[PDB]
Amino acid sequence: NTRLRIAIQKSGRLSKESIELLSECGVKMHIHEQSLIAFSTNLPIDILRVRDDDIPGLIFDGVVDLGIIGENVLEENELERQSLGENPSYKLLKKLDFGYCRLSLALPQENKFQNLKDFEGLRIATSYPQLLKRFMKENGINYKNCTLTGSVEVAPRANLADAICDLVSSGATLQANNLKEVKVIYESRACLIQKENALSKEKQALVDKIMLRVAGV
Amino acid sequence: NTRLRIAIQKSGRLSKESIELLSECGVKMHIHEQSLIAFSTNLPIDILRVRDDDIPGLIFDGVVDLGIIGENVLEENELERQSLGENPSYKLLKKLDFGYCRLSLALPQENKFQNLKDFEGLRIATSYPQLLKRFMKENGINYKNCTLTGSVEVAPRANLADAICDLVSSGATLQANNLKEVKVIYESRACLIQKENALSKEKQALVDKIMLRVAGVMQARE
Ligand SMILES: Nc1ncnc2c1ncn2[C@@H]1O[C@H](COP(=O)(O)OP(=O)(O)OP(=O)(O)O)[C@@H](O)[C@H]1O
Ligand SMILES: Nc1ncnc2c1ncn2[C@@H]1O[C@H](COP(=O)(O)OP(=O)(O)OP(=O)(O)O)[C@@H](O)[C@H]1O
Ligand SMILES: [Zn+2]
Ligand SMILES: [Zn+2]
Ligand SMILES: [Zn+2]
Structure with missing residues (x-):
C-alpha cells in the first residue's frame, strides 16, 4: 500500500x-x-x-x-x-x-583465565550461537554449544555450562551472577x-x- | 554431572x-x-x-x-x-x-476459498517458517514468507501479509481476528x-x- x-x-x-x-x-x-x-x-x-x-x-x-x-x-x-x-x-x-553494548565471553569469578585457549572443549551458553560459532572458528577453539534465549547468566550455576557468551554494558548482571568478563567478541x-x-x-x-x-x- | x-x-x-x-x-x-x-x-x-x-x-x-x-x-x-x-x-x-493444537493455513473470513492454489503468490505470516516451507514445497505452491514470533493473527489486519500459518487449539482467536481456518498442515x-x-x-x-x-x-487418566 x-x-x-x-x-x-x-x-x-x-x-x-x-x-x-x-x-x-x-x-x-x-x-x-x-x-x-x-x-x-x-x-x-x-x-x-x-x-x-x-x-x-x-x-x-x-x-x-x-x-x-x-x-x-x-x-x-x-x-x-x-x-x-x-x-x-x-x-x-x-x-x-x-x-x-558488547558480546563477551565470561567465566566464573574463581577461575584462572590465562588465555582464549582456556575455553578449549568448554560448554558455552549463549543466545547468539552463530556469532559465537564464527568467532571460535576464526580463532581455532573447539567448544560445545548451549543455546538459551533467557537466563544465560544462570547457566554455569545450573550446571548447564562452563562459561557464557553474553551481552554486557555496565557489567552489573555479570557481577550479580559471580561471573567475570574475559574477552569481547563483538x-x-x-x-x-x-x-x-x-x-x-x-x-x-x-x-x-x-x-x-x-x-x- | x-x-x-x-x-x-x-x-x-x-x-x-x-x-x-x-x-x-x-x-x-x-x-x-x-x-x-x-x-x-x-x-x-x-x-x-x-x-x-x-x-x-x-x-x-x-x-x-x-x-x-x-x-x-x-x-x-x-x-x-x-x-x-x-x-x-x-x-x-x-x-x-x-x-x-494444530498448525493451520488461514485467510480473512470475508474471502473466497476455492482451492489450496489460492495461496499462490500470497505473503504468509507465521512463527513456523520451516514447517510452512516444507508443506508448500511438497504441494508445489509458491509464496512469500513473513516470520513473526508473536501477534501472527494481527498481520493481515495490519497489511503485513495476505494470509497466516497459525497455531490454534480452541480456534477462538481466529474468529476474534476475523479469519477462517482453511487447511491443517500439522x-x-x-x-x-x-x-x-x-x-x-x-x-x-x-x-x-x-x-x-x-x-x-496415562491409563489412569482415560
Ligand atoms: N546493557 C545494554 N545497554 C544498551 N543496549 C543494550 C544492552 N543490552 C542489550 N542491548 C541492545 O538492545 C537490544 C535489545 O535488548 P533487550 O534485552 O530488550 O532484547 P530482548 O530481551 O531480546 O527483546 P525482545 O523482547 O524484543 O526479544 C539488544 O539486542 C542489544 O542490541
Ligand atoms: N492454542 C495454542 N496456541 C499456541 N500453542 C499451543 C496452543 N495449545 C497448545 N499449544 C502448545 O504450547 C506450546 C507453547 O506455546 P505458548 O503459547 O506457551 O507460548 P510461547 O511463546 O511458545 O512460550 P515461551 O514463552 O516458552 O516461548 C506451543 O508451541 C504448542 O506446542
Ligand atoms: Zn530478542
Ligand atoms: Zn515459544
Ligand atoms: Zn492515542
Whole structure:
C-alpha cells in the first residue's frame, strides 16, 4: 500500500530511543499497547512493533521498508540465513547513537583465565550461537554449544555450562551472577536499515526526507 | 554431572501439565517461580525451566537428558537444524495426552476459498517458517514468507501479509481476528524425548522407571 512500513522493538532496550528518534524526524504517532501496528497521525507511515529478533528477517524478506535494530541481532540473523543457503541483503542507512553494548565471553569469578585457549572443549551458553560459532572458528577453539534465549547468566550455576557468551554494558548482571568478563567478541550499536528491492518514488522520497532529518538530529 | 536433567517449559501452555505429569509420576519437587533451576526432593533429578523453543536444541546438543515439548516446536527446530547442515538427533519416548493444537493455513473470513492454489503468490505470516516451507514445497505452491514470533493473527489486519500459518487449539482467536481456518498442515501434542547418546546405566534405569509410571498415569487418566 501507500504507507511506509517501519519496524521497531515493541518492548525492550531499543524501544524508547527508537520512538524518540522517529519523533525528532517529524513522525507523530501514539504508542500505547498496540499489539502490532501504530499509525502515524501526520505522515503516511506505519510503525510495526515487533520482537527484535524478527526485524532482520522482515527486512530480508521485503515485508517492511525500514528497520531499527542492534547490529548483534542483525548479524546473528544474517549468518543463520547464510547457513541456510540463502542470500540475505539489506541497505545500511545509518549507525545510530544508542544501543551500545558488547558480546563477551565470561567465566566464573574463581577461575584462572590465562588465555582464549582456556575455553578449549568448554560448554558455552549463549543466545547468539552463530556469532559465537564464527568467532571460535576464526580463532581455532573447539567448544560445545548451549543455546538459551533467557537466563544465560544462570547457566554455569545450573550446571548447564562452563562459561557464557553474553551481552554486557555496565557489567552489573555479570557481577550479580559471580561471573567475570574475559574477552569481547563483538561490539554493537543500533542501526537503521532498509530493504534491498527498490522503493516507490513516493516511498523513497519519503525515506530521503526522514534521512535528511536523521542527519539533522 | 550425575543427576538426571529434564527440561520443561517455564511458563506457558505446557508448563502446568508438565509439572503435574512429573508429580503424577512420583517426582516431588519445590519450585521457586521465577528460577531456571528446580530440584526433585525425593529423586536425583534437576528440572530446568526454560523457554519452550530452547528445549529441542538442549536435547540435540546433549545439554539435558529428557525434555517435554510440543511436536510442532520439536519438528520446526529439527528442520531448522537440518537446513543448517547439522544432524539433529533424539529419541521419542512417548506421545503425551496434552498440548493438543494444530498448525493451520488461514485467510480473512470475508474471502473466497476455492482451492489450496489460492495461496499462490500470497505473503504468509507465521512463527513456523520451516514447517510452512516444507508443506508448500511438497504441494508445489509458491509464496512469500513473513516470520513473526508473536501477534501472527494481527498481520493481515495490519497489511503485513495476505494470509497466516497459525497455531490454534480452541480456534477462538481466529474468529476474534476475523479469519477462517482453511487447511491443517500439522497436528501436534506434547511429547517426551531423550538425547541421542547413551545414558549411564543408573540414569537409564531412572528413565525406564519414569516411563513405566507415565504409561500407568496415562491409563489412569482415560
Ligand atoms: N546493557 C545494554 N545497554 C544498551 N543496549 C543494550 C544492552 N543490552 C542489550 N542491548 C541492545 O538492545 C537490544 C535489545 O535488548 P533487550 O534485552 O530488550 O532484547 P530482548 O530481551 O531480546 O527483546 P525482545 O523482547 O524484543 O526479544 C539488544 O539486542 C542489544 O542490541
Ligand atoms: N492454542 C495454542 N496456541 C499456541 N500453542 C499451543 C496452543 N495449545 C497448545 N499449544 C502448545 O504450547 C506450546 C507453547 O506455546 P505458548 O503459547 O506457551 O507460548 P510461547 O511463546 O511458545 O512460550 P515461551 O514463552 O516458552 O516461548 C506451543 O508451541 C504448542 O506446542
Ligand atoms: Zn492515542
Ligand atoms: Zn530478542
Ligand atoms: Zn515459544
